From Swiss-Prot, chain B:
Binding of [3H]ryanodine indicates that the heterozygous channel is activated by Ca(2+) concentrations 4-fold lower than normal. Single-cell analysis of cotransfected cells shows a significantly increased resting cytoplasmic Ca(2+) level and a significantly reduced luminal Ca(2+) level. Homotetramer. Can also form heterotetramers with RYR2. Identified in a complex composed of RYR1, PDE4D, PKA, FKBP1A and protein phosphatase 1 (PP1). Repeated very high-level exercise decreases interaction with PDE4D and protein phosphatase 1 (PP1). Interacts with CALM; CALM with bound calcium inhibits the RYR1 channel activity. Interacts with S100A1. Interacts with FKBP1A; this stabilizes the closed conformation of the channel. Interacts with CACNA1S; interaction with CACNA1S is important for activation of the RYR1 channel. Interacts with CACNB1. This is Ryanodine receptor 1. Cytosolic calcium-activated calcium channel that mediates the release of Ca(2+) from the sarcoplasmic reticulum into the cytosol and thereby plays a key role in triggering muscle contraction following depolarization of T-tubules. Repeated very high-level exercise increases the open probability of the channel and leads to Ca(2+) leaking into the cytoplasm. Can also mediate the release of Ca(2+) from intracellular stores in neurons, and may thereby promote prolonged Ca(2+) signaling in the brain. Required for normal embryonic development of muscle fibers and skeletal muscle. It comes from Oryctolagus cuniculus (Rabbit). The chain holds residues 2734 to 3472 of 5037 of the full protein. Detected in skeletal muscle (at protein level). Fast- or slow-twitch skeletal muscle. Signal peptide: none annotated. The lineage of its organism: Eukaryota, Metazoa, Chordata, Craniata, Vertebrata.
Length: 48, 665
């Protein structure tokens, strides 16, 4: 979230249990009603 | 078990009015059946079958026989006769001798009392029908019993038939003014907030048996042991599992609990305190059970608001119990340097009670004077001499954190008029406490003591009572300081009583660092571990300017010590021998001691490593190079000794700790 890894209940670097590749991966974003978001995919050093 | 009373049914004589009524009812039923038959177009036929839909019934009933008339003479009259014979609730209606629309009745809500009466009537009808069915089965000989179905889980056929009968009765009782209702109850208290749950009745009944048990406390001069063995684990597991529903008031649930739950909890606390007192050795067999129950109640001591609606009641009992505890503490501190077992090896749960509960924002003069009296009693001839010190420190930290005003310096705001008008202690701080000085003098004395840099020795009466107290005191009022930005206008509007700044935090950090580096590892030193455990957030408001002086000498000394011990171990061992084995086990013990001290000292330095890593991410300096060199040196020293790893694993196993303090969160 902000310079810190989000801690889980277990207390370690929790992942999604070795996701099989299958076809590949792709960044997916969602948005609810009445919400404003900014998707910064990153094209330059100043973007990050 | 259930023995019904058989009321006479055939011995009575039917009156003329009842005969006229049943004749009219039979005529109406025949007319309705004829109307239904002519509406559904049931034609005649030469035989009765189902594939032709033929049933000849449109004929007068005066020419029929008694056998055919008996099956229809009493279709509903049996239930009415049973109701008028069993229940003696006969109403007094009468003395003896162009296209309107139907109204809407489902729009309005259904009364709880009416629904309860309807459910009771349905249950009575079902039970009585089952009674006729059992009687008929017994008369016919018996056999299978497929009707053994609970009323709450009845079959669909019965759940439709009873509803059809109820709606038929409702539509037939609309006229002639028929209405039967026998009940007197209110749903605003019995099934709304308090008595709706079974918890209130459980609390009342357990209070009843507790009072019954207390009625013969002085009987020793069977039943109580069995009662305790039944109730204590059950109530303990009830508190352990079911504890979220009693967190706060039902208006802010999720936690539905009124003042009755808090009153019951306080009564349970008073009852267990009473059982602890009086006789102790008699109840020594259940002493671990009593201690566990006290721990569970302390961990579940919600302590909801009571004085807002109830006039204290239990407040006087709590004050008396606290006064008795203070008197007992004074007695021990006087005679040391029936309740001996409880006051020696069972006061730790008492000092631990509600220690971690009331610690956030979420507090009275009586508690303040009680903790002042206990502190004065402990400080009076408390030296020399019990294994009673972490509990005292926890109680001191809890009493300090839960303070309406500043309890260290008089610079009260919410004082009571009885402190000046009634015979009591003065409202001042320095005069009331002869051994607690002002905050400035106390911090100056602490800094002077820390500046000495003496050895550890034992001295278990100054550091372990002073350092945890200030370490739990300063962060609590750091956010309420006159210089710190308050989160509200009312906080800054009132005159502040405390005075904490960055220099006090720097002095605290320097004193802690000095007391850690002064404790040389040659034996067991649990004081540093206790101090580190009792105050985890001591770096929440750190000042990162003296980082070189804090860390470079310490890491240099640590690396030098590790190098010299590993070199000495290699030189003494070299080969394998009995003397080499003795030296190896001595070095292993030294490594275990150093590892325990390091386990004590990690959380602060790890938090500071996270902090200054964030600072270097924002703005770097010339510290990462030497930090990385130190990390590499210590980890290669650790990796170049398998015996060190084995000793560390053995110490971790023998510690029996989950090491959950590193993740914090």
């Amino acid at each position: 979230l902000n310079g810190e890894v989000l801690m889980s209940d277990s207390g370690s670097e929790t992942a999604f249990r070795e996701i099989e590749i299958g076809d590949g991966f792709l960044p997916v974003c969602s948005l609810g009603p009445g919400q404003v978001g900014h998707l910064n995919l990153g094209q330059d050093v100043s973007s990050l | 078990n259930f023995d019904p009373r058989p009321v006479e049914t055939l011995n009575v004589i039917i009156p003329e009015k009842l005969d006229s009524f049943i004749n009219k009812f039979a005529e109406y039923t025949h007319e309705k059946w004829a109307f239904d038959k002519i509406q559904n177009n049931w034609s005649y036929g030469e035989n009765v079958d189902e594939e032709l839909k033929t049933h000849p019934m449109l004929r007068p009933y005066k020419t029929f026989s008694e056998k055919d008339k008996e099956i229809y003479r009493w279709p509903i009259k049996e239930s009415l006769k049973a109701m008028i014979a069993w229940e003696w609730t006969i109403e007094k209606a009468r003395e003896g001798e162009y296209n309107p629309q139907p109204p809407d009745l489902s729009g309005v809500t259904l009364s709880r009392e009416l629904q309860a009466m309807a459910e009771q009537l349905a249950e009575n009808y079902h039970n009585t029908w089952g009674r006729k069915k059992k009687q008929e089965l017994e008369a016919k000989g018996g056999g299978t019993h497929p009707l053994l179905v609970p009323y709450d889980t009845l079959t669909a056929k019965e759940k439709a038939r009873d509803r059809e009968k109820a709606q038929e009765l409702l539509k037939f009782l609309q006229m002639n003014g028929y209405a039967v209702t026998r009940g007197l109850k209110d749903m605003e208290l019995d099934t709304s907030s308090i008595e709706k749950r079974f918890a209130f009745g459980f609390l009342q009944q357990l209070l009843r048996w507790m009072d019954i048990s207390q009625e013969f406390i002085a009987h020793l001069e069977q039943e109580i042991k069995f009662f305790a063995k039944i109730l204590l684990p059950l109530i303990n597991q009830y508190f352990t599992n079911h504890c979220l529903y009693f967190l706060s008031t039902p208006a802010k649930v999720l936690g539905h609990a009124s003042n009755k739950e808090k009153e019951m909890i306080t009564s349970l606390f008073c009852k267990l305190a009473a059982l602890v007192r009086h006789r102790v050795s008699l109840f020594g067999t259940d002493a671990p059970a009593v201690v566990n129950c006290l721990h569970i109640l302390a961990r579940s001591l919600d302590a909801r608001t009571v004085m807002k609606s109830g006039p204290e009641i239990v407040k006087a009992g709590l004050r008396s119990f606290f006064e008795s505890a203070s008197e007992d503490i004074e007695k021990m501190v006087e005679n040391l340097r029936q309740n001996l077992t409880y006051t020696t090896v069972a006061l730790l749960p008492v000092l631990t009670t509600l220690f971690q509960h009331i610690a956030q924002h979420q507090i009275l003069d009586d508690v303040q004077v009680s903790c002042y009296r206990t502190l004065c009693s402990i400080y009076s001839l408390g030296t020399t001499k019990e294994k009673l010190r972490p509990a005292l420190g926890e109680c001191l930290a809890r009493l300090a954190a839960a303070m309406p005003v500043a309890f260290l310096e008089p610079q009260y705001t919410t004082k009571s008029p009885r402190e000046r008008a009634i015979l009591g202690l003065p409202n001042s701080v320095e005069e009331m406490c002869p051994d607690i000085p002002v905050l400035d003098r106390l911090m100056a004395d602490i800094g002077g003591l820390a500046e000495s840099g003496a050895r550890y020795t034992e001295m278990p009466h100054v550091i372990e009572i002073t350092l945890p107290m200030l370490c739990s005191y300063l962060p609590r009022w750091w956010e309420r300081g006159p210089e710190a930005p308050p989160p509200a206008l009312p906080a800054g509007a009132p005159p502040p009583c405390t005075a904490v700044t960055s220099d006090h935090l720097n002095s605290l950090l320097g004193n802690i660092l000095r007391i850690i580096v002064n404790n040389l590892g040659i034996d067991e030193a649990t004081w540093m571990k206790r101090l580190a455990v009792f105050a985890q957030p001591i770096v929440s408001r750190a000042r990162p300017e003296l980082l070189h002086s804090h860390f470079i000498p310490t890491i240099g000394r640590l690396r030098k010590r590790a190098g010299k011990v590993v070199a000495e171990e290699e030189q003494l061992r070299l080969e394998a021998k009995a003397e080499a084995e003795e030296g190896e086990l001595l070095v292993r013990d030294e490594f275990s001691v150093l590892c325990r001290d390091l386990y004590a000292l990690y959380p602060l330095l790890i938090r500071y490593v996270d902090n200054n890593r964030a600072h270097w991410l924002t703005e770097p300096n010339a510290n990462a190079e030497e930090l990385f060199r130190m990390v590499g040196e210590i980890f290669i020293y650790w990796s170049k000794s398998h015996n060190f790893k084995r000793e560390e694993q053995n110490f971790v196993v023998q510690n029996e700790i989950n090491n959950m303090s590193f993740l914090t969160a």
